[PDB]
Structure formats: C-alpha cells, structure tokens
Write a protein that binds this ligand. Sequence first.
Ligand SMILES: [Ca+2]
Ligand SMILES: [Ca+2]
Ligand SMILES: [Ca+2]
Ligand SMILES: [Ca+2]
Lengths: 149, 22
Amino acid sequence: GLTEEQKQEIREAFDLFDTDGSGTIDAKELKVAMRALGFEPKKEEIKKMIADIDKDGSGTIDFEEFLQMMTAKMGERDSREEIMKAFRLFDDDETGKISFKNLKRVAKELGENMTDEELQEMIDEADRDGDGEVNEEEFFRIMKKTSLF
Amino acid sequence: KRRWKKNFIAVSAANRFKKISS
Ligand SMILES: [Ca+2]
Ligand SMILES: [Ca+2]
Ligand SMILES: [Ca+2]
Ligand SMILES: [Ca+2]
C-alpha cells in the first residue's frame, strides 16, 4: 500500500513525460523522452510500449496506467539491476560516480528547469563521504533502497 | 529527497519501456 508521498513522487515522474500536462503520455511524448535519454527507439518499438501499458484503448497512458507500470512486482535481483542500470545512465563518463555534471545532463534531458544551486544541493545531500560526487552506495541510499546494495 | 527519487522513477520508467520493446 503506497503512501501519498510515494504516489506523489511517481506523479512528478509521470509529469516529465507528459510535457503538455494533458494528464496522458502520447506516442510522440514517449518518443521525445526516450531519444533525450539516449535510447534510440524505433517507430514500431514505441507502438508496443504504448499498447502494453494503455489498458483502456485510448492510445495514451494516464497516471493510473503509468502507476500500475511503476508498481508492478519485481524480485530483488531484478530490482538491484534496475537501480544499477539507472546509475549507469547517469555515469556518462564511466567514472563510477555521479557528478554535478552527470546530474545536470540528466535533469536537462528530462526537461527539468533546475538552477545550478538546486543541482548542487541535490549533489550535496546525497554525498555523505564529502567527496563532491555520488558513488553507488550513496545512490542506493538516497533512493531509500539500502537493503539492496 | 523527492528530486532524487523523481529522477529515479522517470529513468526507471524509460528502462521499463525499453524492456517492453525488446
Ligand atoms: Ca500529454
Ligand atoms: Ca489509456
Ligand atoms: Ca560519472
Ligand atoms: Ca561521495
């Protein structure tokens, strides 16, 4: 059973695909978001993404369809590699740590309108060992996913 | 806090959609 805070966080994530704020992800919004993140999605690959999550035949994913997607069961092994896959999406320069610049790169692709101060406070709060970057452990930790690391 | 997790959930979603395609 998800708290309001966990639903809210999913919703804020939903909001980054739904740029026109219609309350749905269309196929063209999905395509723009996947390219930006560096996956090279194909027109037909997008049709399958859309069809598999939209359960009411609208051709769009609303927050409730997205919310099933983002709360479906997953084993611990699958979930670890999930966090890991996401950490490596950031690590662009393959250095083993998430730097200010990684984050700035990723916030921009998702269309976050963040200042450097706001990015630095995001770096600052995860850091922990005071090195100015975010390693694997402290990544797991700020995601509130400690027992997986 | 929420910013970190928000990014996580968006990038996790990207990763799920990619998984669906293949
Ligand atoms: Ca929309
Ligand atoms: Ca729908
Ligand atoms: Ca890095
Ligand atoms: Ca650190």
